[PDB]
Ligand SMILES: N[C@@H](Cc1ccc(O)cc1)C(=O)O
């Protein structure tokens with residue numbers, strides 16, 4: 005029940021600071037002969053359970069994704085129905101403020117924690133007694149993988165492309181049947197998409213997902229998210245029959261094309277060059293002399309040239325994954341036509357890739373902190389936001405339950421996870437160059 | 443065996459029913475009320491056909507298998523055929539003047555099997571009070587065609603050629619026959635076809651192998667053995683094979699290719715580089731052509747028009763995806779390979795049949811406005827009496843079982859279907875211009 009305290013996965017002394025791994029490396033390991041495949045099985049089975057929980061269960065997938073934006077309801081006893089300065093419905097998520105990274109740090113941890121708890125439930129109910137200890141130890145080693153949107157994907161060893169995760173592009177995934185070596189079962193992949201049993205605009209009150217406004221070429225459109233049963237990447241196009249919109253597909257080739265063509269939304273007039281997504285990410289991590297406000301948010305901003313802040317890169321990756329053009333564009337942009345959930349703040353968190361993208365945004369924040377350790381909400385602009393309550397997330401302090409604040413998560417290790425790149429801090433500048441340097 | 447192909451049987455209350463444009467038909471079914479009986483029949487019948495086992499020669503897999511891989515027997519007619527490269531090949535005719543007539547019979551086989559499965563479905567699922575109405579809809583149904591050269595409608599004249607609406611929907615809503623008012627969402631059997639295992643591991647002799655293809659002068663083995671599902675564009679070199687198991691229905695990329703029309707033929711010296719619509723217009727309206735020139739790439743055996751088979755070859759490539767290996771950066775937007783671009787496995791994708799239904803329609807249109815042009819030029823006359831194996835029919839005169847021959851299907855109405863555009867010869871030239879000019 006409530007309040008639901010967010011702590012990260014509990015500490016076990018024989019599992020010191022387990023790491024959140026690159027989801028492609030993790031998937032390739034899990035599906036190799038030298039792995040027991042238990043973590044993949046647990047993630048798939050737990051996330052499937054979470055997705056199938058009912059709407060009145062605040063730890064259902066729908067309700068956890070609902071924290072971020074639409075349908076703008078309460079969560080954990082904290083009221084929804086909030087409004088923007090524009091007068092428009094808004095959710096709990098922070099955007100365009102210096103608490104963007106820290107709000108999302110807690111959010112990603114909540115998701116990881118709920119998954120872990122569901123893994124433990126799965127083990128109790130499905131694993132032979134003599135195997136539970138082994139399966140429990142795998143749950144305790146597991147952490148939410150990140151999608152490294154700036155790292156070139158692996159392409160074999162006998163022959164330079166950014167890609168959506170392997171596992172995100174698979175409609176089905178094979179998992180273990182506990183206690184039955186050699187037998188796998190192919191199941192719908194809960195990372196491929198999220199769908200409800202009806203169009204999301206018809207869910208029981210107060211949960212219905214509405215259409216969402218967007219502006220394209222100086223014109224307002226309604227992105228028809230109310231007419232979707234499933235999340236989609238690029239599958240919503242104007243003047244297509246609404247039965248296509250019900251499930252417009254996971255058009256991952258178009259997402260990959262966008263990641264590698266990097267159509268930045270910003271005006272890059274006077275820039276020395278147009279950086280790729282990997283080079284922009286490299287510059288984020290290596291440009292010296294920046295304060296926390298400049299790194300963290302679009303709020304700080306006439307803007308700097310030849311590098312981009314964390315939130316601005318994140319914004320572009322969202323558009324490129326989900327699809328950002330509903331109406332038919334000009335001839336040269338037809339190759340990227342189509343709209344989908346990840347491009348729209350009110351509904352992006354319904355696409356399971358949301359959490360993997362935000363896991364890497366958390367990683368980029370941790371890396372930047374590591375090489376800029378004296379820069380934390382302590383310039384004239386960002387200092388005012390430092391003690392904002394990160395609603396709706398509760399923690400125990402006092403002997404009182406209170407809202408999270410940014411200082412509580414400055415050290416991400418207090419939430420009992422780490423990243424390989426930040427664990428080995430001595431190698432960090434070399435690793436940044438190896439991964440993202442041109 | 444033998445399975446005697448007739449077309450859907452003649453019913454005096456149903457004179458020459460028409461094969462409709464599948465997008466018009468989909469809207470007729472869904473858009474002005476829930477007039478969904480034919481849609482339900484087609485979905486339920488094709489689902490039954492796709493779930494039949496390999497030992498049933500009227501299963502989807504075995505019917506698609508007639509065309510190409512895995513190159514086995516069908517209807518008591520042996521496999522073991524070789525193509526011009528000395529490789530294993532199927533019964534399908536390509537690069538000969540019987541290309542249109544072989545495929546005319548093949549599409550009719552598919553339609554007839556579906557109709558027969560519709561009748562079984564009605565017997566088993568429709569209550570007495572509904573039988574007349576459902577039987578009437580089945581007897582009216584014919585296989586819809588995909589008009590790849592007509593702009594998709596908006597709700598209004600469109601601007602874009604597109605895959606059929608229904609082909610791009612993973613799920614489809616159908617009627618519950620005994621329960622008027624109730625409907626159910628089911629997997630759409632037109633969206634894709636898949637087996638229960640990777641197709642490369644099916645029992646002998648049905649396993650689908652990889653298929654060697656040339657790209658930019660070099661050989662590649664398209665990994666169709668590693669697919670469980672058919673795909674449009676989802677097979678890319680140096681992707682993990684777990685992706686290849688089901689590479690998706692990447693219909694946006696197919697639509698992009700249809701509208702960019704990257705012809706594989708060298709059009710050096712042409713007046714212009716036509717769009718798909720205009721190339722189709724030219725096919726139907728260029729005067730003074732003979733059957734050999736219209737029907738096949740064999741005639742020229744390589745001016746400002748392209749023959750039926752050459753257009754069909756490009757559309758197959760554009761729907762299925764024709765680049766497995768990664769191209770240069772300027773062409774990345776169309777990277778990816780899939781079943782419809784590959785003769786050995788194209789028939790597994792359910793759009794194959796809708797495409798070939800339109801190829802049949804284009805042949806019927808051309809025949810209508812080129813009366814007398816039929817296997818009678820110096821080149822195509824030798825092929826006129828080829829047996830169209832493996833297709834059997836009952837010859838009523840000798841009361842014998844024989845293979846189909848091209849002259850048996852010169853009049854497509856003898857197979858008891860027609861096309862709206864070919865009903866009135868006074869109207870056809872105007873309609874060609876209205877649709878494609
Ligand atoms: N569409 C936003 C980017 C964005 C999308 C979804 C998000 O959750 C966050 C940011 C933009 O163009 O700025």
Ligand SMILES: N[C@@H](Cc1ccc(O)cc1)C(=O)O
Nearest residue numbers: 755758759782783784785788
């Ligand atoms: N790939 C063939 C075209 C084709 C593909 C499949 C077919 O079934 C028929 C033709 C070509 O490029 O010529």
